[PDB]
Design a protein around this nucleic acid. Structure first.
Ligand SMILES: Nc1ccn([C@H]2C[C@H](O)[C@@H](COP(=O)(O)OP(=O)(O)OP(=O)(O)O)O2)c(=O)n1
Ligand SMILES: [Ca+2]
Ligand SMILES: [Ca+2]
Length: 421
DNA sequence: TGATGACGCT
DNA sequence: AGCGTCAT
């Protein structure tokens, strides 16, 4: 009676399907329902693919594939190019499409912007309200695109409905504090949210509904595209019993590899065999407690009330022979970046009633193994591109070993530390 | 041959 | 503060 079960909140994660592709398909109907991809920089191997329609994925086309290589798998692949301004990729169209979706989501609940195409939603309050509206049963008709993970327990839609039926058939609708009922009502609301997003933007999305952010995110990916998935507390032991550790958000990197290496396990469920102290011993007090709870389906990270980015940045690589070797080059490109940055900052100030107060300048030198050879901050007191680019140079001036030596393979300008205005 | 953006550590 | 990790 004193063991927490992490069933206190209803949390959703809404993620747009093949997002940059949908933005380009809305604009150009010729791309709709076709194997297509979004690329940046046409000149090297046809350009780098950064988003892929589900039709193209069926041919094996992936992110981070050169377009020329993708065409070997999928000869009729259609392409849309990222806009280029001031000599660099410009992502404005996708950021603006993002604002369309985020503003719609914000009508339903306060959201946390987690990326350009996804947000978490805390629906706990909304669910309580809808529950008061309700002791009536919940019809399957209200969950037309919802999967219940773990159920049923020979066509795709047939399986979905059978699982949904088993779920609804055993719900206790007379209990307003039932976690399973709360999740179900959550899923009804997310059906409504996803309907509004598609009606008002044209964009389809997937979603996960569970009791916390990590499970919601995991759920979202289980049935994509254009579907949503409910992961109940009860579904966790079976789900985690064969779930590779790397699939869980934040464990896809070196920490996750060390969990696998040090403990000699493969699946998230196997973590339950360790005491909290054992896990803290290996991975630190914070990670240890987090893992101990998370492998039990429990996580407390709040949905933060933030739908605007906290930083506004401009970045460009200069690979191989294109590395910047003269001061005229370095200053010209700092200026190009500063000009895009000023543009976005001025728009931000008018839209969002805030001003950035710190400019961060980051570079990479040719032979450096680190992604950043220098990261330095200075004051950002005026939205002026020439001043920002001049300040950036001043701050990286002493890096030159010299004519710029070694040549620079990356420049980065980032506006940070916003204050109300 | 990429362009971002959040958060943790000392 | 500057660096790193993780991700999208
Ligand atoms: N390494 C990456 C990953 C993504 N994106 C951009 C392109 C994507 O369209 C968008 C959202 O990324 P997702 O990882 O959510 O992938 P998609 O939305 O493209 O596909 P899915 O339907 O699998 O979510 O962000 C990017 O520029 N670089
Ligand atoms: Ca997506
Ligand atoms: Ca995403």
């Amino acid at each position: 009676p004193h063991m927490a079960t992490g069933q206190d909140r209803v949390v959703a994660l809404v993620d747009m399907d093949c997002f940059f592709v949908q933005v380009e398909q809305r604009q150009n109907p010729h791309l709709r329902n076709k194997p297509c991809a979004v690329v940046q920089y046409k000149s090297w191997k046809g350009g780098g693919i950064i988003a892929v329609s589900y039709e193209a994925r069926a041919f094996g086309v992936t992110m981070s594939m050169w377009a020329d290589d993708a065409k070997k798998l999928c000869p009729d692949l259609l392409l849309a190019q990222v806009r280029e301004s001031r000599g660099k990729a410009n992502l404005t169209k996708y950021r603006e499409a993002s604002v369309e979706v985020m503003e719609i989501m914000s009508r339903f609940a306060v959201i946390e912007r987690a990326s350009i195409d996804e947000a978490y939603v805390d629906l706990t309050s909304a669910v309580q309200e809808r529950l008061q509206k309700l002791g009536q049963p919940i019809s399957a008709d209200l969950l037309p695109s919802t999967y219940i993970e773990g159920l049923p327990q020979v066509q795709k839609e047939g399986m979905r409905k059978q699982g949904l039926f088993q779920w609804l058939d055993s719900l206790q609708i007379d209990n307003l504090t039932s976690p399973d009922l709360q999740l179900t009502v959550g899923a009804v609301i997310v059906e409504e949210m996803r309907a509004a997003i598609e009606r008002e933007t044209g964009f389809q999305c997937s979603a996960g509904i569970s009791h916390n952010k990590v499970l919601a995110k995991l759920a979202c990916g289980l049935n994509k595209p254009n579907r949503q998935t409910l992961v109940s507390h009860g579904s966790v032991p079976q789900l985690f019993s064969q779930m590779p550790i790397r699939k869980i958000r934040s464990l896809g990197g070196k920490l996750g590899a060390s969990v696998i290496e040090i403990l000699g396990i493969e699946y998230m469920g196997e973590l339950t065999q360790f005491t909290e102290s054992q896990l803290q011993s290996h991975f630190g007090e914070k990670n240890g407690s987090w893992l101990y709870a998370m492998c039990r389906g429990i996580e407390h990270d709040p949905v933060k009330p933030r739908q605007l980015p906290k930083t506004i940045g401009c970045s460009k690589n200069f690979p191989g022979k294109t590395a910047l070797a003269t001061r005229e080059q370095v200053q010209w490109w700092l200026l190009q970046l500063a000009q895009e940055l000023e543009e976005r900052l001025t728009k931000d100030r008018n839209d969002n009633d805030r001003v950035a107060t710190q400019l961060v300048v980051s570079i990479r030198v040719q032979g450096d193994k680190r992604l950043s050879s220098l990261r330095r901050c200075c004051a950002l007191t005026r939205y002026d591109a020439h001043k920002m680019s001049h300040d950036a140079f001043t701050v990286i001036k002493n890096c030159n070993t010299s004519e710029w030596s070694p040549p620079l393979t990356m420049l980065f300008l980032c506006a940070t530390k916003f204050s109300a205005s």
